[PDB]
Symmetry: C4
Subunit: 348 residues, 4 copies
């Protein structure tokens, strides 16, 4: 019994800023690489980007623009059931685009899920703070029993054991991430978390055994961080802060120092729960149309995949190697000892 | 002999910001967890929080508010014997609440302890800069001889060897912490200390063999640090800076730069002593009623225990696993890359 | 399953992770030799090469570089006729050494012909990713036409890539993916190798063929150069430390009453016009005056480091110098600390 | 093969400095007031406190060496002087009550001429101070001084390795000074890339010197009194301080006022100003005025007594031979300092 006491401090975790991708032999160029991904037979994305289901990130206009760029948007749940079904319905009829919707694990959940399926949603995201809870496992079984063909994205988890549990309950996709969010204070106020790159790797190690894809959710600050998440085993990444400043996102621009900002807050923050916190309320710079951000993101992915000799995302997922570095290595990776004159489209 | 020379740099120590608690399978929700703890046959607490025995944190008005919230207050020793005996009696009169009192290891110590026992004190805290000194060990043995049933809290120590010595001397509770204090300069001016999370774990490993509880004293900056201290083996945590700003603490609010502050200083500082100092004098924001801080602290603990699947503190103490992370992991754990506009009640 | 389980096994070190250990020395800083040979046709008196960037090296910089005992690489953001004119302009000024960068494009061999006609000493087949077959194929195709031409191929960061370019016919391999001061490759693509590990891994392979490597990028102080040479590199390539000298492309600009020079990455938005995704940024460095003053501090720092290590020449430093690893607290100790600096030193700013 | 052994050991060694570690508290029966801080460097050189003021033109002259020795310590008169001035500075300290005093000598052709004038001024120890103590020029000078003066205390430095320590001992040095690059004003590790983290250097050099009965000096990098306790516990007999002494009243240079606060100039002996084209290995700076030396020494020795009590050391030999460290990360360092509290007043030992 003494084993659990002696294993308290054995595990080690890595995050994005701890590693770099090692360049390998390459026969492919960034322009000729493929960035398509399959989450299920009914759900395939042309770019591996999903906008997060938060009240400051994704509504009708964001989900529309995401799908038009080849990605996916998850309409948040901080609205009435009919309002969310009305948002899903807007995205589907506006050219047959893909759309998702967030649902919380509550007694009224199944009523909301039914209304979303009639709007022909492609996937429901049962997103909760702790996916390794029995309430979450049961809700996935109750939805899989009622809708055997519905794409179910279950999260959030950070361990292989939680990944195996949600897969066994009938979830097609597992969303990974406890604590990496830019607006998240879970690790500070509750002390609980797993470094995101290790969380993605540990969960992808289990999901591989079942043919299940995983979503790297939260913590991505630059386009290179997305490449690290995919190379660690993730099929797709979920972004919040990098999308909150975009024009097609809910909320209006506010002025700070002559510059435009958009509100970005955690769904566990005081403000978001009104209509103990595990998030903060803030603002991110205004970034303009989604196409300009998505173009820089995909372009960094194509560059990274060319460096790794990856013709497609599966090759990157199963062959790419990292190298660990210290804090001095992180300062070398960024621009240093030179006064930056202009703001770059991919570096702010 | 050469063994001690070659053993100089073998040990490694971890602090709160080096680790994260791994989320586990959970059948319980934060509202349904138990935060009760037993320190001795005569000492049972409803919340695992003790106010530190400093002239800037806890006097009668603070100890009353602590006990009423389910915790414990330690009346500080910077007083005459007659003043301290009356403070214990004031807290005792207000509904039969639990209260403790700090006593230093000096020739006059037993005279002060006698007056505290007549005021019906529940626990005596034998506070010294170095708990593994022979003068402290002798004082513990003689107080156990004169008062065989009196709760004796002995500290501070940081090693398994020091913990076993105070336990064999007759102390029911051992207080752990050398150098982690927010106002403490021991590790800077004397070079001596042990990282608090390693100190708590090393001492709890020894105290666990005897059924003795340990107190994680100092270094707690956020509610998540308290969850980590308890998951590392501590029954109860002792706070100073997180309590110095509340209304029920000695001293009155001062205005600095148009904002409200309360004085907070170390008991080894120049001001508190009026040897070389091992503390500094400082300032903390006014935080309002004690209940608001206690709610945020306990609420974060309930969240952590729910993330870890702990129904009570013994499950967290015996089963919770940590994961080590780098400074980049710490940067991910905090909010990042978002301009914070509002203050959260648990994150400032 | 090895490839999946080996994802996070490697560890990498950069300049600020290590220090050179002082060794027995009968050598004085003044008496060391800083000469190095890259090929039979390329001998440098100082192991310093100015980078081939449109804000770092043109004719006047290559002239001053060679006159100090080094080498300049004329950048490619110009016409073929302009670059051939820059090479000969440098060559006519006393028969000085000069190189020129050529990208892996359809016109590359057309540009290479014009450079060889100008009596260029080395072409740098410089690409963002040197381990692509387009680069290897281009090296053989250049090696076939010019058996006597010095070919510098980069950039790479692994032992496998060094062996690949050597098999294609490259005399010198340039090492560095992401360490540059103006570089965002590791930020926008997630790809890189810590430069000191990259140099060491490439030198381990390149020594097996007698091939020298160039430590390219990441050098902030003169001591970083000594660490790069002690890690296995024959010569180092500098950009930011040279962009502020008088002999460099661009004109001095005034910022806050002080004089500055533009310094930008060749993968930046501004340099690529001269919607694509950049791998560099546009910046500015303080104006530094004559090139001789910068080189004197650089060579002076190298001479001191070699004296501490007991290396009379650079080959001894390459084969004997020992490092010791340190933490961030060691880096804070290595720099000056707890003292407010009142005057700016020629080597520390 | 042999040629490849040096190539594969390039990145094997690891080094620790003061901010990487903490001293582990041990069983103790002694109190800080009751400990002994006496130390013996040789039979001719015994100090009551283990503190030496550095031989720099902004740290130690006659008035500093006088005040240092009177506190039980030692001052090293710097060498940026003529031979005649340095000998009279030594004589000034000797005439002021027969106090102990040292003098710095560089390894140059004039060295032996300079040393002679110092011995006639009755100096107690000469410091053969060089940027690189493991050079053959330094080894030769120690043998050449040991040949002429068999009883003279010779302090040779600076080194950072066990091999360099053993070489200087074999050349005839009674004391070895350890420190390459840790100085607060030092840029050696930045401009030349060379150094060893000071705590590992002290430990590695004391390991060798212990075998010959030779004491070592921890030179440079000490920012707080706890750094001194760590250096002594890492194997050093005595520590040499510069920045912590450069601000005291009895040190060369005058107090200058900036923004209402009093400052003194503090610069490295490898800075342009002190040597006044060339490549410097130091910078020029400024430190706050600290008042009389007695207040700084009192806080320093007091911090040592506290640490020795935490470690159960009755004297410095017990601390050098028994004290145990524990290693910590950057987060451990932030916990060690005061944190998350706005400091209102300055403590005598902290900032
Ligand atoms: C409501 C709140 C503040 N906290 C929790 O629900 N805590 C929590 C839930 C279950 C367990 Cl077992 C432990 C803790 C929240 C709201 C929205 C998002 C999150 C979030 N951290 N991730 O989605 C959290
Ligand atoms: C008085 C003072 C400044 N120092 C000591 O008493 N030092 C000390 C005592 C015994 C030994 Cl063997 C070694 C050192 C002090 C006062 C109040 C609290 C502390 C403190 N660091 N923790 O409680 C210290
Ligand atoms: C154009 C741009 C921005 N990026 C790339 O060409 N990317 C890239 C090329 C090939 C492969 Cl397989 C993968 C990525 C560039 C331009 C000029 C210089 C560089 C540079 N990093 N080193 O020379 C990069
Ligand atoms: C002159 C100068 C700038 N540099 C050297 O003399 N360098 C040096 C000497 C010998 C060898 Cl083998 C290698 C390097 C200097 C002056 C004063 C002090 C120092 C210093 N670093 N410690 O005392 C250095
Ligand atoms: O307040 C919250 N607490 C914890 N995590 C949150 C909260 N709100 C959103 N998140 C997570 O953070 C992700 C976005 O993180 P980001 O892309 O790094 O800003 C979301 O997709 C959610 O998974
Ligand atoms: O001045 C002192 N020097 C060293 N430690 C102190 C001093 N005063 C209080 N402490 C310790 O610091 C703890 C409070 O630390 P905090 O909760 O981080 O502010 C107290 O409970 C004591 O254990
Ligand atoms: O835009 C770019 N992106 C990435 N690397 C670059 C770029 N421009 C120049 N470099 C590299 O950076 C080196 C100079 O870096 P520096 O010495 O740190 O300033 C050059 O010699 C190139 O190898
Ligand atoms: O300019 C220099 N370069 C390198 N080290 C120096 C220089 N000047 C003084 N030192 C060293 O630094 C020590 C004092 O440094 P500090 O006590 O940390 O400020 C001296 O005793 C010398 O060993
Ligand atoms: K960089
Ligand atoms: K976070
Ligand atoms: K230094
Ligand atoms: K502290």
């Amino acid at each position: 019994s003494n084993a659990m006491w002696e294993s308290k401090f054995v595990k080690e975790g890595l995050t994005f800023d701890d590693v770099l991708l090692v360049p390998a032999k390459s026969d492919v160029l960034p322009r000729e690489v493929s960035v398509k991904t399959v989450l299920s037979e009914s759900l395939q994305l042309n770019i591996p980007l999903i906008s997060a289901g938060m009240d400051t990130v994704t509504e009708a206009d964001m989900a529309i623009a995401m799908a038009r760029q080849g990605g996916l948007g998850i309409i948040h749940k901080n609205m009435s059931i009919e309002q969310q079904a009305e948002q899903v319905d807007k995205v589907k009829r506006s050219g047959g685009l893909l759309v998702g919707a967030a649902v919380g694990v509550t007694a009224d959940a199944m009523t909301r899920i039914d209304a979303l399926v009639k709007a022909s949603v492609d996937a429901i995201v049962l997103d909760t703070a702790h996916g390794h809870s029995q309430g979450v496992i049961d809700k996935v079984k109750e939805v899989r029993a009622k809708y055997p063909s519905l794409n179910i994205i279950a999260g959030n988890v950070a361990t292989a054991e939680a990944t195996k549990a949600l897969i066994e309950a009938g979830a097609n996709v597992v969303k990974v991430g406890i604590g990496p969010g830019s607006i998240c204070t879970t690790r500070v106020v509750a002390g609980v978390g797993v470094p995101q790159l290790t969380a993605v790797y540990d969960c992808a190690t289990e999901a591989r055994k079942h043919g299940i894809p995983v979503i790297a959710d939260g913590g991505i600050k630059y386009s290179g961080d997305m490449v690290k998440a995919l190379a660690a085993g993730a099929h797709v990444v979920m972004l919040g802060s990098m999308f909150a400043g975009v024009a097609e996102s809910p909320g209006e621009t506010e002025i700070y120092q002559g510059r435009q900002f958009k509100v970005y807050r955690g769904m566990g923050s005081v403000g978001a729960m009104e209509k103990v916190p595990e998030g903060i309320e803030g603002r991110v710079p205004y970034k303009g149309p989604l196409a300009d951000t998505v173009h820089q993101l995909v372009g960094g992915l194509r560059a990274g995949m060319g460096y790794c000799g990856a013709q497609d995302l599966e090759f990157l997922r199963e062959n790419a190697q990292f190298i660990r570095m210290s804090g001095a290595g992180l300062l070398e990776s960024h621009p240093h000892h030179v006064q930056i004159t202009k703001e770059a489209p991919n570096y702010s």
